[PDB]
DNA sequence: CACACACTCTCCAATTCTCTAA
DNA sequence: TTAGAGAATTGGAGAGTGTGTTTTTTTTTTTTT
């Protein structure tokens, strides 16, 4: 039922009144709650999110880019417009179906971890197995690694892998299993 | 970066109470009938010590924070030690 | 929207000053009631009818000019009760999110508009006339037809009186007719006030006692008993001269502060340079302080000259008093004084007995004892003010009322500590209970002063009972040891301190007059070991917290604070408890005050304790470290 | 009491004062916003009586206590209140001009009943 | 072009709430 | 009765995005030349 995505709410007065919107979304969660149906939008700014009535008052949908590339729903209402800049297509389609049903009316935590981490020395903090699984960026420095470990090799989404000032004598072949690696420093 | 805190362990028993023991060794109070100016001198010395300890806060904010810190292990142990010998 | 517009049009139209109702008013009004009953949770029909202003444009003219048409009149009264339903009932609570709060504000705005419209004397005249010709019949002659009409009439009056003042138009200055003042004047001129007095005094119509109590509460919402009791014929000259004198006092204070600031800064412009090294003062490093803010500032140098204060985080933000006090219109004040006098003489005993019967039988809403305790506080204070006669309030002077108030206060205290999501509301209910308790404790003193040996006898009886039972003594310590500035306002702290002062005054005088040794399975007692329970750090912390506002405190409040601290210092020898750095900053402000001569008691007490501190400091330099923290039995180790 | 144009120093700021002068140039009458009525665009709450500084000012906060909006507001020009406004240059009268000086000019603002008088 | 201002968003960690032992 | 260990909420550092800028001559026309 609930949807996790970036959201951008645009009050439709702004363009004709000559005012320009932010141009990008904010990480959020959308909930289709219901005696009568509501849409709750919650962001970092508001755990206690904003409600929006949708019992009889959806204007229209946009669906040209529901494949989640340069995408949105651009859900217009009296008076606001709700854009969903990045989600996953299947859950978003189910959410849109539920929204349509709620508008027909007769029937019925945004947690995250950053890209980046740093080890300035192993004795301060070892890498261990407590890394995030989809980590994007790590520095290790002044550590006594003679050879690169599975601990950093198994990370599924690394853009940057830095081992500078470590003691590596040899590096593996399985370091090349990192699909999105763009920065490698030794 | 090391953002500082007025907490129980960074400075209150390091640049704080050990120096506060010494702040009034050379004070110049004059006793009964002069309580107003004696208090002014006392407040100036206490304020100066607090500023050199944690310069981020104003004096009353510092006081309201340190009164809360009075409940912590390190602070009361140092207080009893200062009461006893050194 | 358009269908509502059609029915609203079908109600009829006004022409000059006469309303021409359509023959289908009955079915259109029933349709309006149906729409209101089938509202959305956002209360869309409420907002739309308020925007259309049909209450002001149709229903009031119909009510005032076609009151002989009884079915239409009944339907209009029911519709108006529905529309004037308060917003807190409409939404259940104050919404926590923007959309429902916007809808709440819309409904509240239209309620304020209805209150503005309802000040016309004609509407309340019709209401008083129909209520009068209804109540003319005997109780046994009434049926559901008339009893429900009395309920709806009194609920309409209750709803219109309940409405909060608009934040926009609550900026009225004193001695001016606010919307509430005009509404009370409408009640006065219509004579519904006399009907309320009749309903309160009637033994037969006791069934409406809770309703009448709520009407009287909302009527006397803004007033203060002693200030109201002081009203009389010669007040215009007194208040005019007082206004001129207070204006001059304010002006002189502002001039003095301006001169002090003009001396604190120099007589050179700010970009006039110059820098100094203060050789003795070490900087935050080891180097000498370089001072840039001008030579004039070094007379009263402080390191916080250029510092930004800190954002108090949301959790630690102190509670603030919910309203300013304004002196209402003199005509309304005279009317309310006369109402209060006649009500006290003719109605009060029977009404309070009836309300107590309702609370005992448990046929009252959840918090109606708050209205009961309000009435105790207000009317007993008014009685003691001006001609005190205990017969007028003798239904309240029983020990059972002390017990009831103590039980309610302890209940509110527990619920404030546990039900944390409306702790402020529980604090307000507890504040009402505290004021009622305070007024009972003041009334027994007035009974002692009064000449009748009978009331002196019963005063002795109730004093013996209260001082014997333990909870009345322990409740003050219980309140002090869990008071929180974060939750309870400074007005509550003032009332608690003054009530404690009065209670200890009575208890000390009682024990001084005679022994009366057994207390509480009894045990011995003495007031000194009772006072030693007030030697805790938390209570004196609260007392100095109240002392910080000595400039704004009343003189009696300052006397209460300084007398309690003098009792703890001079008579219990607990000066080391009050040797504190924050308290010394407050003393520094007291000594530096230009108006220090106006606070002779406070500065003398401050200099006494400061002299004791500096004697101890000369003997032992560790007292300077002892100033930095609150303490327990270091109060004796220092000694 | 009457004051000279030479005596309009900073000490007279905010004080009631009377001066004499000779009008040199009068500008067109304009409508000046004295209090703006604004709509909060992301909660639809209307803020009335927003008083104007010497800059055109929007609400500092939304009137809805739980609304977090602080820059997205729309003025409702039909429900706002305006005043007639006119600025006129004056200079010292011939009698008051000190000897040898250039005439000192001043800017005077006229409002409401006083414009074009 | 490009070097300063102006503004928003996100993450990180420091403080306060809740439950437990000294 | 105090206070300390674990969990959740709020303050603000800082990373990222978008905006704005560096007297002179020839010709007419009315009045005065
Ligand atoms: Zn808003």
Curated annotation (Swiss-Prot), chain A:
<protein>
    <recommendedName>
        <fullName>Leucine-rich repeat protein 1</fullName>
    </recommendedName>
</protein>
<comment type="function">
    <text>Substrate recognition subunit of an ECS (Elongin BC-CUL2/5-SOCS-box protein) E3 ubiquitin-protein ligase complex which mediates the ubiquitination and subsequent proteasomal degradation of target proteins. ECS(LRR1) ubiquitinates MCM7 and promotes CMG replisome disassembly by VCP and chromatin extraction during S-phase. May negatively regulate the 4-1BB-mediated signaling cascades which result in the activation of NK-kappaB and JNK1.</text>
</comment>
<comment type="subunit">
    <text>Component of the probable ECS(LRR1) E3 ubiquitin-protein ligase complex which contains CUL2, RBX1, Elongin BC complex and LRR1. Interacts with CUL2, RBX1, ELOB and ELOC.</text>
</comment>
<feature type="repeat" description="LRR 1">
    <location>
        <begin position="134"/>
        <end position="155"/>
    </location>
</feature>
<feature type="repeat" description="LRR 2">
    <location>
        <begin position="157"/>
        <end position="178"/>
    </location>
</feature>
UniProtKB/Swiss-Prot annotation, chain B:
<comment type="subunit">
    <text>Interacts with TIMELESS (via N-terminus), which impairs TIMELESS self-association. Associates with the MCM2-7 complex. Interacts with RPA2, PRDX2.</text>
</comment>
<comment type="function">
    <text>Plays an important role in the control of DNA replication and the maintenance of replication fork stability. Important for cell survival after DNA damage or replication stress. May be specifically required for the ATR-CHEK1 pathway in the replication checkpoint induced by hydroxyurea or ultraviolet light. Forms a complex with TIMELESS and this complex regulates DNA replication processes under both normal and stress conditions, stabilizes replication forks and influences both CHEK1 phosphorylation and the intra-S phase checkpoint in response to genotoxic stress.</text>
</comment>
<comment type="similarity">
    <text>Belongs to the CSM3 family.</text>
</comment>
<feature type="region of interest" description="Interaction with TIMELESS">
    <location>
        <begin position="6"/>
        <end position="82"/>
    </location>
</feature>
<protein>
    <recommendedName>
        <fullName>TIMELESS-interacting protein</fullName>
    </recommendedName>
</protein>
From Swiss-Prot, chain C:
<keyword id="KW-0498">Mitosis</keyword>
<protein>
    <recommendedName>
        <fullName>Protein timeless homolog</fullName>
    </recommendedName>
</protein>
<dbReference type="GO" id="GO:0072719">
    <property type="term" value="P:cellular response to cisplatin"/>
</dbReference>
<dbReference type="GO" id="GO:0051301">
    <property type="term" value="P:cell division"/>
</dbReference>
<dbReference type="GO" id="GO:0003677">
    <property type="term" value="F:DNA binding"/>
</dbReference>
<keyword id="KW-0132">Cell division</keyword>
<keyword id="KW-0131">Cell cycle</keyword>
<keyword id="KW-0158">Chromosome</keyword>
<dbReference type="GO" id="GO:0005634">
    <property type="term" value="C:nucleus"/>
</dbReference>
<dbReference type="GO" id="GO:0031298">
    <property type="term" value="C:replication fork protection complex"/>
</dbReference>
<comment type="function">
    <text>Plays an important role in the control of DNA replication, maintenance of replication fork stability, maintenance of genome stability throughout normal DNA replication, DNA repair and in the regulation of the circadian clock. Required to stabilize replication forks during DNA replication by forming a complex with TIPIN: this complex regulates DNA replication processes under both normal and stress conditions, stabilizes replication forks and influences both CHEK1 phosphorylation and the intra-S phase checkpoint in response to genotoxic stress.</text>
</comment>
<dbReference type="GO" id="GO:0045892">
    <property type="term" value="P:negative regulation of DNA-templated transcription"/>
</dbReference>
UniProtKB/Swiss-Prot annotation, chain D:
<protein>
    <recommendedName>
        <fullName>DNA replication licensing factor MCM6</fullName>
    </recommendedName>
</protein>
<comment type="subunit">
    <text>Component of the MCM2-7 complex. The complex forms a toroidal hexameric ring with the proposed subunit order MCM2-MCM6-MCM4-MCM7-MCM3-MCM5. Component of the CMG helicase complex, a hexameric ring of related MCM2-7 subunits stabilized by CDC45 and the tetrameric GINS complex. May interact with MCM10. Interacts with TIPIN. Interacts with CDT1. Interacts with MCMBP. Interacts with DDI2.</text>
</comment>
<comment type="function">
    <text>Acts as a component of the MCM2-7 complex (MCM complex) which is the replicative helicase essential for 'once per cell cycle' DNA replication initiation and elongation in eukaryotic cells. Core component of CDC45-MCM-GINS (CMG) helicase, the molecular machine that unwinds template DNA during replication, and around which the replisome is built.</text>
</comment>
<feature type="modified residue" description="Phosphoserine">
    <location>
        <position position="101"/>
    </location>
</feature>
<comment type="similarity">
    <text>Belongs to the MCM family.</text>
</comment>
